[PDB]
Symmetry: C3
Subunit: 223 residues, 3 copies
């Protein structure tokens, strides 16, 4: 009885000792786990700061991207506006380039036709002066013919003549008349008063019973 209780007391001494050993091993393991807790919480706080920093940069980046999107859209509308203006300018200037070239051709045509008309005016004036000069000469010839008519014409009746209009008349006193042939003749009183014609010749008419003509042409008496 005494020996049995004494042995269970020593067994208790050894079990207590062993339990303290086992207890100390668990306490060490708990101390390791607390070290891990502290390491985890440090990492947690460090990671939270990095999270804030990154999310901050990402939001700041997104502000710059939205500004860029907005600018691109604005640039897009400006380029949209410029292109048709340039289209229209191409159409306009290509038509002007043709129209200018045609104008240069038309101006050279005008110069040619003006130059030729200038020479034509000179040519024809010179020609018409030539015809006028020839005509003036002809007039001078007529004028010469008029002067010759003027200096050879008869305008004035002199001795024995009388002008009536454009007619001249011989004017005569006694002893002469004009016969039915318009000839100037002597008037011998119808040859009944001693003087007569023999042919064209004047004679004294004589009774040849009593008169003759002698060799002097005088009248004389016969027998």
């Amino acid at each position: 009885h005494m020996e049995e209780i004494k042995k269970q007391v020593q067994v208790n001494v050894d079990d207590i000792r062993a339990a303290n050993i086992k207890l100390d091993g668990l306490g060490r393991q708990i101390a390791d786990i607390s070290n891990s807790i502290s390491t985890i919480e440090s990492r947690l706080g460090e990671m939270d700061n990095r999270l804030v920093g990154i999310s901050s940069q990402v939001t700041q980046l997104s502000n710059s991207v939205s500004q860029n999107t907005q600018s691109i859209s604005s640039l897009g509308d400006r380029i949209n506006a410029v292109e048709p203006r340039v289209d229209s300018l191409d159409t306009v200037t290509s038509n002007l380039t043709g129209r200018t070239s045609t104008l240069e051709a038309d101006v050279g045509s005008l110069r040619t036709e003006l130059a030729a008309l200038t020479t034509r005016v000179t040519t024809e004036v010179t020609r018409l002066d030539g015809l006028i000069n020839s005509g003036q000469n002809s007039i001078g010839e007529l004028s010469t013919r008029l002067s010759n008519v003027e200096t050879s014409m008869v305008t004035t009746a002199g001795r024995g003549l009388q002008k009536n209009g454009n007619t001249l008349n011989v004017i005569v006193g006694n002893g002469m008349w004009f016969n039915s042939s318009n000839q100037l003749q002597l008037d011998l009183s119808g040859q009944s008063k001693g003087v007569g014609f023999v042919g064209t010749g004047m004679v004294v008419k004589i009774d040849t019973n009593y008169f003759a003509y002698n060799s002097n042409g005088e009248i004389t008496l016969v027998s």
Copy 2:
């Protein structure tokens, strides 16, 4: 005895208590193991997050470079559009001024061609008219030529028989026995009618003494007795 039993009872309580302590130590080990399982889990999650964090900030650096380049590209593009826009304004000005001046030139050479065509016709029209007057002049010259020829052939210019031309005066010219009175009438010289020739009226006669001479029926001087 009674004191031996009190020791025995405490020794038994101590056996029970050591047993209790060992079961409590087993329960602490269970809880320690469960906690280590939670820590394990936590460490794995921290590892996922750390890796994702490194990936993200790396992705953000490359994105940053692309954005910076885009912003810089955009500025350059804005400068080219800003330069081009007033050039187009300027071209709108030149082409609209060229348009007006070209239309004006086109109407101008239209007018010129019309003016030049009228002047050509005028030159034709006047040369015709002038040739007209010259050819009419030639008509008049001929008409006057003909009138001069007609006058040339009909006029008296030359003194013929019994005549003499002094200047533009004509005179009858006479031999012996003829003269002209104050009136320019031609006359005969009858010797004052004192030598047997006389006038009675306009006619000539032999002036005769009628004691001795008479005219016979035949017109001859005869003797009366």
Copy 3:
């Protein structure tokens, strides 16, 4: 027997000391368990924030990609336009000079044409005056002829005859023309009782039988 009781009492004390240490470990476990709960709340919240940042970043990547393409596209269009404007610059400044030269050329044409138009008027006026002065001269000649036609002899009246341009006296009995073209009397050669003494006509008489009395008649002596 007393030493047995003393070790029992020591064992009671040691058991009490071990239970005290056991409770201390239990406290630590409780604190640690609370840390674990707190750690899992904080982690869950941080994981959600990370997912949100990742989602934002991938959206941003795609938006940045689109912007880079649009930029390139815009650069193409600017690059298409710039040389077109350059060419239009050149061509319109050439056209500007060609237009100005055309304007100077059309101006010269107007000037020259206006002078030619005036030249035509000037020369027609000079030529018309020459023609008019020539009509006047013919007119002068015509009226001068007319006035000489009313005064000139053209027609033969009494004792005259016209042959061409020659006017002749014509004569019958008793008259003829001597070889000085003079009119003269035909007295039958003065053989027939009529003749001249000096300038005067006489009855030629044999003065052995006849004479002239005071009355000029022929009588017997």
